């Protein structure tokens, strides 16, 4: 038996009693990643299908331990808030993501993270097509590529997530979100097999050339594209 | 008979071929003395600084020795460097310009228990530190009046000019009555000189202490010193890590614990652990030996380790 009443109780009602009365501030940060580590182990282990009334009372209450913490290595804060975004995708309420990416941006800038910044920066882009805000996209492709080409993060589908971040920009847009986007897929069919490239990667290495300005750009960059032996076997080389 | 002719003409080649080593190497050694003795023509030259320019084509400049002089634009040069307030160069033969000539964010790292904090500033910076400029905390005697503040702007100036620029504090404590007027003088102007437009990206500083009671309340006041990390167990990972990383080149003993020289040398750091290890080393090398058996070993952490934990006063 299990009420879990009185468990959330303790726990939310007894934060820093031990800290209050030590005027000594110890700023241990050695055990408290694993004391969370392991609250947040626990509670992986009974998230599945153990109660549903306890669960919200738990998890609204450890989203506000996020913004009454303001000092962690950032990964659980994220843990948390992720694992429950997972769930809201399949609720149907899409009103949380306000909050899961408004505290995104809290929840990545303070700290150093390489790996961890690619496998939780996708959320930005995942309710966005049940967003579909304008001045949001604005904000987030601009705070999605302030620093970063291709070092300091590995994966393997690398190549498909690019694709996952400006093809909304050109949902957004309408011709020049792919002008710098469809210059930067040469290095893609060099990761995979080129069988699948001619349907995407050989199709779209025309439109950035195509739709380039008229000023400059068209001057140059129909330089990069020729010289390729794959570039003639396509029938529209004439066109 | 013909199959050993080969043989042998290969070695009377060979040793043929391999005599043009023994001269190859010096002779782009002797070439480059003759290219220096060629590089040595370009001779009289003098030096001279720019305040006001009236022509676009020809300026006034100023020199060294005190008279001045006007000079013309030469025609390899451009307007780039052209232009006042860059010191320049001259020549004795028709006052030529040949080229120009350039004149010339926190974290606190304290541990109530124990000592050797700046050890581990001298750990960080043996690691990684690639900027070379200490500040030492002896030098805010203030015997005189007090104008610090013209150092402090002088110095974090210097630091602007000066790219390189990463500073270790240390033995604050002695210098932590108007005892706390020159302390909130010199942090004031910290605040002054750090809070505004100050380039935060470039600067960079460690500051260190011995004792958790002098810990001067104004510096554990945030802004100055943000990011502050406690020293109660001195990292035995990274201090296993440390030891693993910094015992390659040094030999010792097949059958070594390292688990036993970790925790029988503790609380300071591991870079200190490294110094009791290279102290081992330096008494394994007293007994004329590589390996010795642990005894001499134990006799360098209990007697190196306690002698620093005794006379880290």
Not at chain 1, 121 to 141: F, G
Not at chain 2, 73 to 95: E, F
Request: aromatic share 6%; glycine share 4%.
């Amino acid at each position: 038996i299990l009420v879990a009443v009185v468990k959330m109780c303790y726990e939310a009602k007894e934060w820093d009693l031990l800290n209050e009365n030590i005027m000594l501030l110890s700023k241990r940060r050695s055990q408290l990643k694993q004391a969370v580590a392991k609250m947040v182990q626990q509670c992986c282990t009974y998230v599945e299908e153990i109660t549903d009334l306890p669960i919200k009372l738990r998890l609204i209450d450890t989203l506000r331990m996020v913004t009454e913490g303001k000092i962690y290595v950032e990964i659980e804060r994220a843990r948390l808030t992720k694992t429950l975004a997972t769930i809201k995708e399949q609720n149907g309420d899409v009103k949380e993501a306000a909050s899961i990416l408004q505290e995104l941006q809290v929840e990545t800038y303070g700290s150093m993270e390489k790996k961890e910044r690619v496998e939780f920066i996708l959320e930005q882009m995942r309710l966005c097509l049940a967003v579909k805000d304008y001045i949001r996209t604005q904000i987030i492709s601009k705070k999605i590529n302030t620093k970063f080409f291709q070092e300091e993060n590995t994966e393997k589908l690398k190549l498909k997530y690019y694709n996952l971040m400006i093809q909304l920009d050109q949902h957004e847009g309408s011709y020049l979100s792919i002008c710098k986007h469809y210059r930067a897929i040469y290095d893609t069919p060099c990761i995979q097999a080129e069988s699948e490239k001619w349907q995407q990667a050989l199709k779209s290495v025309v439109l950035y050339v195509i739709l380039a300005p008229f000023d400059n750009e068209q001057s140059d960059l129909v330089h990069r594209i020729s010289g390729d032996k794959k570039l003639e076997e396509i029938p529209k080389y004439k066109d | 008979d013909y199959r050993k002719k080969l043989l042998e003409h290969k070695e009377i080649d060979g040793r043929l071929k391999e005599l043009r080593e023994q001269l190859k190497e010096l002779t782009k050694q002797y070439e480059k003395s003759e290219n220096d003795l060629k590089a040595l023509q370009s001779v009289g030259q003098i030096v001279g600084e720019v305040l006001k320019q009236l022509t676009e084509e020809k300026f006034i400049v100023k020199a060294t020795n005190g008279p001045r002089y006007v000079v013309g634009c030469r025609r390899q040069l451009d307007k780039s460097k052209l232009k006042p307030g860059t010191r320049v160069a001259l020549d004795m033969t028709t006052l030529t310009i040949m080229r120009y000539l350039p004149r010339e964010k926190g974290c606190l790292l304290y541990g109530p228990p124990g000592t050797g904090k700046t050890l581990l500033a001298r750990a960080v910076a043996s690691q990684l530190d690639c900027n070379f400029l200490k500040v030492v905390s002896s030098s805010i005697v203030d015997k005189y009046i007090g104008e610090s503040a013209r150092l402090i702007r002088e110095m974090f100036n210097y630091a602007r000019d000066h790219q390189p620029c990463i500073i270790f504090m240390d033995e604050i404590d002695a210098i932590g009555t108007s005892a706390d007027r020159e302390i909130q003088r010199t942090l004031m102007e910290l605040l002054n000189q750090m809070d505004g437009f100050d380039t935060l990206h470039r600067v960079k500083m460690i500051m260190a202490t011995n004792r958790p009671d002098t810990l001067d309340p104004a510096l554990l006041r945030p802004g100055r010193l943000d990011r502050k990390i406690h020293i109660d167990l001195p990292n035995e990972q990274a201090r296993l890590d440390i030891l693993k990383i910094h015992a390659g080149p040094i030999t010792k003993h097949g059958e070594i614990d390292y688990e036993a020289i970790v925790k029988l040398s503790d609380g300071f750091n591991g870079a200190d652990l490294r110094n009791v290890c290279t102290e081992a080393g330096m008494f394994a090398i007293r007994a004329d030996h590589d390996f010795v058996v642990q005894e001499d070993f134990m006799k360098a952490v209990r007697k190196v380790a306690d002698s620093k934990k005794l006379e880290s006063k």
